[PDB]
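User: Show me an example of a complex going from sequences to structure tokens.

Assistant: Sure. Here are the input components:
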Amino acid sequence: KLMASFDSTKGKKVDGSVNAYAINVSQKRKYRQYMNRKGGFNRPL
RNA sequence: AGCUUUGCGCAGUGGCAGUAUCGUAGCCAAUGAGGUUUAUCCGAGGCGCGAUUUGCUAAUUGAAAACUUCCCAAUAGCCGUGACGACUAGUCGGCAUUGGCAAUUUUUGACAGUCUCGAGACUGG
């Protein structure tokens, strides 16, 4: 009724917000080319 | 032979450099420039105009500051699962990837500070 048998969460996935990771990255700005391209007028992807 | 003087040239230490350093082709000047001192004396440039090479390096703006770039795709531990295989439903080896790996036996920290002569003691109020 306690809800027995002492537990040890090793390897087992834990319950909740324990798994919280957060990565702050910001990549370099990929701009497009306009002047002196040799390519056709609309942008490349 | 040594010392030494004067002028010039070279290099070096240092100092100075817009009341400084010069050019002058224009004029004047020791056949005298310029002189308030000392003038029956002194003695050198003066007035104007006109100037203030070269190499190296830094920094800034600028898209670009002058010596022959960006982007996409793919390659470069263990527990389960799927097959393949091997050995007797079970076990083992390698391969593969479609969940997980901070709660006492390990990989998410009983560590940190102190003191004494390789060895121990104290504290975490």
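The lines above are the inputs; the final block is the predicted structure for all two components together. Residues 6-14, 18, 30-31, 33, 35, 44-45 of chain A lie near RNA strand B (CB under 10 Å from a C1').
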